[PDB]
Structure formats: structure tokens, C-alpha cells
Design a protein around this ligand. Structure first.
Ligand SMILES: OC[C@@H](O)[C@@H](O[C@H]1O[C@H](CO)[C@@H](O[C@H]2O[C@H](CO)[C@@H](O[C@H]3O[C@H](CO)[C@@H](O)[C@H](O)[C@H]3O)[C@H](O)[C@H]2O)[C@H](O)[C@H]1O)[C@H](O)[C@@H](O)CO
Length: 370
């Protein structure tokens, strides 16, 4: 059983736990309640194990996608923020923490892919994907490529495929319809074809992956790449002068990147749910609370409007939120895994030529709706 009278918080080792402990200090200073921050190894696997026996931390931080599984097992308490607090966060972030019609966690941060570009090579990046082929021809004239990004993970290629109509699961009033999948439709077809054509026309290579693209951009060999806030620190050290902007549109429609929302759930077995709510709502989700964590390790964009408005002074973060609002929250249902694997295969096969675009998407679709 969990100890009453204090708060134990679990957050991953790559997050700003030292910064979070700073908020815990303020909480104890005001309430006299001690807050302990821990970052155990493989905590995403450990949590469901210990929470299943009625133990574990009072609060757990992790990408919202993982919370769907936890909520299915009844590991998370339904939260009770009032309307006043709900208005404080962007609407789409609340959708990311809803399972079976119930709010099961508090949104903290927001992450999505953006277009990263070299200001010296391309001071005026393209607003459309259609402009890229011509830009590549001009840049190649001087030994540089227009764009290089990870083509091995569907997470990176989907923004393009979704632009004109592709989608994983239709999200209606309440939840996701596992029977309405949009991988084998006109929009996805047009998007994947554009991607495959970039390859066949030599504007991109089917084998380009994360590390290949990262080094190419960091060495000034390619003018653009597509990546998230987590990659910025590994560019800053290269000195290259880069900018971060909205993803290019396709067929006049904005690219739609998936969105990940770092969230904080409350253990269903915690005898400290009220303390957890007080801490999360009135200490962490405030300008001062998020600043403490962010100052330690950047959160990227955040769910709290007031602080996001301040953070947006950084064009990289403003761009992150802009793309996020045009994208879609990653579905938190079990079937999303089937989606990732089926689509990963479709893109790889279509790009290598093993399958035609139509065959690739048809097979992915038929598999996902099983
Ligand atoms: O390159 C490092 C990345 O892991 C960083 O994470 C960021 O990018 C990944 C995409 O690579 C993104 O993950 C999301 O999309 C992938 C699908 O591309 C999902 O993976 C599932 O499908 C895979 C098959 O394609 C399969 O191998 C996995 O096991 C499946 O889980 C993820 O589930 C989904 O979350 C991250 O969201 C994004 O943050 C890196 O980890 C940073 O987060 C931290 O440096």
C-alpha cells in the first residue's frame, strides 16, 4: 500500500527531475507535505507492475500514449479539474488524457515535428512540399541537398501522408472508432505517392534514416530536416545557423504531425489524490512551476496557455505548437500499435519498390482494421 501524508513522484531520467524537485520544495514549504522525486530505470514497465499491487508512486509522468494502457487496467484515478482550470490548457491536450470518456491525467508538455532549416543555405524555406523538387535541383548545383529526414519510422513520414486526408483512427465525440481507419484512402495515397516520387526522382534516398539525416544537417550538407524539440540540443553544438518553422503544406493542406503530450497521472491506489491534485494544478501547472522544470531541461512547448505564450517568444517553440495544433494527438488505444507497424512496412515497401503505393496502403489498411 502507498504511504499517506506525502507525495512520491516518478518521472523519466531524461526529464528535468532536479527542476521538478524545486517545485516539490515550494509545495512542502507551503503545506509541510514532503514531495519525493524519483527516476527509476525502465519506469514505464515498472509502474504497471507495482501499481497493479496497489503500490508505486502517487504521481507518474510519461507520454500520454502509454496512459491508455494504464487506464485500461484501472491504474489511474479519474482527475477532477474544474472548468476554470480546464480553460487554462489548450483543448487538444485534454483529448490526449481522456480514456473511455474520463480524464485520467494532467497534460504538461506538447511535442510535434517541425521543419528545421539552415538559414545560410535556405533563408526563405518553402511553404509547400511541391516546391521542394525545384529547390533540390538548385541546391544540388552546389553539392547540397534540399531535404533529408528519417524515412524509416512512420512517425516522420505521416505528416505528409496525412496532409491531404490520411488518418489513423477517426476520433468522434468521445473516442476513436477502430472501424474507421484512413490509411487506404485518396489523401494518404496522394501523400505517399509524393513521397515515393521524391525518391524515384532522386530528391531523397529510401535508406536515409535518423542518424544519417542528423549528421547531414549538422554538417551543413542538406538545407532542411524534419525533427522534434528533443533534437535541438544536438544541433546547437554544431553551430550551424538554424531556424524552426511550420511544416510545408501539400495540396494546399497543412501537414499533420502526430502530437505527444507528456502527462502526469495519479495512481488509483494513492491515498493522496487530493494532495496530488493540489500539487499538479496549483504548483506545477503555473508559470513558476513550469519555468522551474523547463529551466532544468526544456519541455519544448507546454499545455499551459499562460506559460506557452511566454515560451513562444522562442520561434522554435512557437513553431512546435503551431505544427502541433495542425496535427493530431497520438491515439491512446491498443490498435495504434498495429497502425505503427503496418504503416512502417507500407512506407518502407513503397519507397524501396517492393510494393506499389496502392498495394502498400491497401495491405496496411486491411491489417489495421482486423
Ligand atoms: O529517434 C529517437 C526517438 O525515439 C525520439 O522520439 C520521438 O520520435 C519517435 C519516432 O521515432 C516518436 O515515437 C512515436 O512514433 C513511433 C513510430 O514511428 C512509435 O513506435 C511504435 O512503432 C514502432 C514501429 O515503427 C515500434 O518499433 C515501436 O515499438 C512502437 O512503439 C512510438 O510509440 C510513438 O511514440 C516519439 O513520440 C518522439 O518523441 C526520442 O525517443 C525522444 O522522445 C527523446 O529523445
Amino acid at each position: 500500500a502507498i504511504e499517506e501524508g506525502k507525495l512520491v513522484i516518478w518521472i523519466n531520467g531524461d526529464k528535468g527531475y532536479n527542476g521538478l524537485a524545486e517545485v516539490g520544495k515550494k509545495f512542502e514549504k507551503d503545506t509541510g507535505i514532503k514531495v519525493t522525486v524519483e527516476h527509476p530505470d525502465k519506469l514505464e514497465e515498472k509502474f504497471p507492475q507495482v501499481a497493479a499491487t496497489g503500490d508505486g508512486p502517487d504521481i507518474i509522468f510519461w507520454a500520454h500514449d502509454r496512459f491508455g494502457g494504464y487506464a485500461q487496467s484501472g491504474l489511474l484515478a479519474e482527475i477532477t479539474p474544474d472548468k476554470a482550470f480546464q480553460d487554462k490548457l489548450y483543448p487538444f491536450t485534454w483529448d490526449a488524457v481522456r480514456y473511455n470518456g474520463k480524464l485520467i491525467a494532467y497534460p504538461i508538455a506538447v511535442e510535434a515535428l517541425s521543419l528545421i532549416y539552415n538559414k545560410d543555405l535556405l533563408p526563405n524555406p518553402p511553404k509547400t512540399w511541391e516546391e521542394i523538387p525545384a529547390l533540390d535541383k538548385e541546391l544540388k548545383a552546389k553539392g547540397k541537398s534540399a531535404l533529408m529526414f528519417n524515412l524509416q519510422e512512420p512517425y516522420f513520414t505521416w505528416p505528409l501522408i496525412a496532409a491531404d486526408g490520411g488518418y489513423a483512427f477517426k476520433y468522434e465525440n468521445g473516442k476513436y472508432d477502430i472501424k474507421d481507419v484512413g490509411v487506404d484512402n485518396a489523401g494518404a495515397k496522394a501523400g505517399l505517392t509524393f513521397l515515393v516520387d521524391l525518391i524515384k526522382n532522386k530528391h531523397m534516398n529510401a535508406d536515409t534514416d535518423y542518424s544519417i539525416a542528423e549528421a547531414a544537417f549538422n554538417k551543413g550538407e542538406t538545407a532542411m530536416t524534419i525533427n522534434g524539440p528533443w533534437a535541438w540540443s544536438n544541433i546547437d553544438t554544431s553551430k550551424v545557423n538554424y531556424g524552426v518553422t511550420v511544416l510545408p503544406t501539400f495540396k494546399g493542406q497543412p501537414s499533420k504531425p502526430f502530437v505527444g503530450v507528456l502527462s502526469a497521472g495519479i495512481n488509483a491506489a494513492s491515498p493522496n489524490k487530493e494532495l496530488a491534485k493540489e500539487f499538479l494544478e496549483n504548483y506545477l501547472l503555473t508559470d513558476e512551476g513550469l519555468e522551474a522544470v523547463n529551466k532544468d531541461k526544456p519541455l519544448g512547448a507546454v499545455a499551459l496557455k499562460s506559460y506557452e505564450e511566454e515560451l513562444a517568444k522562442d520561434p522554435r517553440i512557437a513553431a512546435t505548437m503551431e505544427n502541433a495544433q495542425k496535427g493530431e494527438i497520438m491515439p491512446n488505444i491498443p490498435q495504434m500499435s498495429a497502425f505503427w507497424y503496418a504503416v512502417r512496412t507500407a512506407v518502407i515497401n513503397a519507397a524501396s519498390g517492393r510494393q506499389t503505393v496502392d498495394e502498400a496502403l491497401k495491405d496496411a489498411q486491411t491489417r489495421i482494421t482486423k
